[PDB]
Symmetry: none
Subunit: 200 residues, 4 copies
């Protein structure tokens, strides 16, 4: 059994997941969590904060998972790295599709809340972000390919693929599990393509 608070957060994820911020009611969350609607504003003051706390909760978890990954893989080659990492992200998207579907909702929410969160992210991001800067020094670039330019490309790809598939396979984890294996290939090739394009 989860503490009422924890069960709110969780229902909030399911609910925001299925409808996104605006379309999602607080009372559905209260029904789904089996709690008094008021309790929600006990813990979270208002809906905006609630979404926020929910999103932090979830990212807390991934960050944890990522940080552990990184250690166990600091040593890998960069692409080899991304290759493997992307794998795990899909494995998560399939083992926790509600969380996945919920993180995607971030764009639906007002300038204010959104920018707030994004900033809280750049912090967490800067780790991985900076690590990549280093593992590129390790590569023999073409004489027209900035490390700056390279980073943008990879960081776009990396997180862009995330949103690219993730809306396409939204509410269809079944269909993802099916297709996972191909995707992983397509990726491996895509990265392989970039490596060949950036190196001498």
């Amino acid at each position: 059994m989860l503490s009422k608070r924890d069960a709110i957060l969780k229902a909030a994820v399911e609910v925001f997941g299925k409808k996104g911020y605006d379309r999602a009611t607080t009372d559905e969350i209260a029904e789904k969590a089996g709690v008094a609607k008021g309790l929600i504003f006990h813990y979270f003051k208002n809906k905006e904060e609630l979404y926020y706390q929910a999103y932090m909760s979830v990212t807390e978890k991934l960050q944890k998972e990522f940080e552990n990954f990184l250690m166990k893989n600091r040593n890998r080659d960069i692409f080899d790295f991304m290759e493997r990492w992307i794998e795990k992200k899909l494995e998560y998207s399939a083992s926790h599709p509600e969380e996945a579907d919920f993180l995607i909702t971030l764009v639906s929410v007002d300038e204010g809340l959104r920018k707030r969160i994004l900033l809280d992210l750049e912090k967490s991001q800067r780790v991985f972000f900076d690590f990549v800067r280093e593992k590129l020094k390790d590569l023999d670039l073409a004489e027209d390919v900035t490390e700056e330019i390279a980073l943008k490309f990879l960081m776009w790809f990396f997180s862009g693929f995330e949103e690219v598939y993730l809306r396409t396979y939204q509410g269809k984890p079944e269909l993802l599990k099916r297709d996972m294996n191909t995707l992983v290939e397509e990726v491996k090739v895509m990265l392989r393509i970039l490596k060949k394009g950036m190196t001498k």
Copy 2:
């Protein structure tokens, strides 16, 4: 002067642009178009249809512009093509930022309307989409790089760059016009990178 109907559509774009579907009221559109709120449901029956009509209007325009581009360039090499196209798209995004900002709202709207529109798109898309399929037969691929795989990559890139910058430079057209010229280079490199990666 625009017909009252045409001025609704237009205000609807500005409005949906700045708030996205749900947060955007019909009565703001009626204030901003200077019309009776009832008029809106004269012309468009309901808000969903309204967003829809607005989105079609706008895409009618781009498709027209694109189709003309394609003729004047059907002959070019594929990357050379995208290179130059991306250029025009930014030029438009800067000359018509409201339209830009509105097209991006598509993700905020319910399964129903969204899917509808996306389908109406694949239609429009299929032209360019299919043209690319052809200009790739013209290329000497690596022995592990399906035409299928290639197309995904490019089509992702192509429209993914759109969303990548467009949120980053949202409400900052000044800052875009400044940076436009770099971007175009960054792109040319990126495409160059891909060409080198896919070919023998």
Copy 3:
């Protein structure tokens, strides 16, 4: 029959009158005015504005009445003036006890709204206010009695008596009508007392 809008304002006066700002519900106003609750926020955006509009409405009226009084009495001696004016104010308080009871509510409402209104008043007040400054030049003061000092005294008395009685005889117009006559005397004496105290 009153326009729905006008009937809201009116019920709002009754209601605020009986409970004051905070304790008073909007839906009671809607019941009492026989209207959709939403219509209220059609016309007045929110409750604060509503109270405000109600208070302006009412003061509009008194100001009108006062301005007419003043003309018909510019010529009187100052006390003779206040004497008579006070009479009329009670005559109003008795002929329109709801309005009376409502104006008193002003103190119950948050710093914001309150200060706003009070300022809108000093404007209207400054007329009477300034007129009094003049009708004192007409008086032979004691050699220790500033016109400044005198004004404060009278302006305090004048409006202070208002609140002094008005809360005491709140919701008791019956009891006021009874007592009106004495009060008018007590006043006449009180003013008479001040005149004797300020003059040589």
Copy 4:
């Protein structure tokens, strides 16, 4: 250190002081007193009783202070008396502005509680009240100035000045301390004015 109970009462004063009855939450009082919200209804059963207990506490204090003043001054002439008293009251209002600001909230509260308290007051008041009745037999009145009439005037003035300034210099103790000395003169004049007006 104050007993948790005593610290509730005190925070209740600050809180009711700044927002008045209805706008003031019990949980703010609990935050500001650093206590469990339930504790409040341990000690005071409900919010109405709480305000009440708070108000009595405070008036216990003033009455005590006043009763001591009266002894040390029972002998003085009546105006001389009020003159000097008013002085002390300001001194208190400046040394304890929260208490001041809280006593003024009395009008914001429902018929019931209010009337209750007011009655408990007439009791406390009757002392000073009755003393004044006596010190007026000592005065040679005008042949149209009832002792009754006189008392009203003075009792109004006396406590009316309190409310007159106190709202004007609300949340501005700095500005009061500045002006204190003038006020005291303005008063002395005012009283002087009344003495001259009531006597032969």
